[PDB]
Amino acid sequence: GIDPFTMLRPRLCTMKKGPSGYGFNLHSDKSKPGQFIRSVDPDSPAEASGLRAQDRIVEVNGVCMEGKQHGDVVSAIRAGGDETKLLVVDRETDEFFKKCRVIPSQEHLNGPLPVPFTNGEIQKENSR
């Protein structure tokens, strides 16, 4: 809808090996797990696919890598073949997901994001 916060949604980056590889660098954080975009090359399929800096890898090739290690994620990317699809979330987007305890995925891409407060609504509390 026309919600001012409905823009807090992830993006699916689809990138094929251009020259002889891809053009981005991942950084593994020593406190928080997951691969974050350290830097991306503007003249590569990575930037074209929508690989924003400081964004975190959530899914790769349709596989969710929340809680996975550096080797697991990287090996999955390499096992994608000539191209790979990365799912990333912005700082604002990820903070939104954090506060709602929601894990970003492909469905949230074109979805109107999770419902506020997760549940709420004590509608017809009969409990009989």
Burial track 110-128 (b if 16+ CB lie within 10 A, e otherwise): eeebbeeeeeeeeeeeeee
**Amino acid identity, position 91:** R
Q: Nearest Cα to 84, choosing from 8, 9, 21? A: 21
What are the residues whose beta carbons fall under 8 Å from the beta carbon of 128, sequence distance 6 or more? none
Q: Nearest Cα to 55, choosing from 96, 78, 80, 26? A: 26
What determination technique applies here? NMR
Domains in the chain (CATH in brackets) are 1-109 (2.30.42.10)
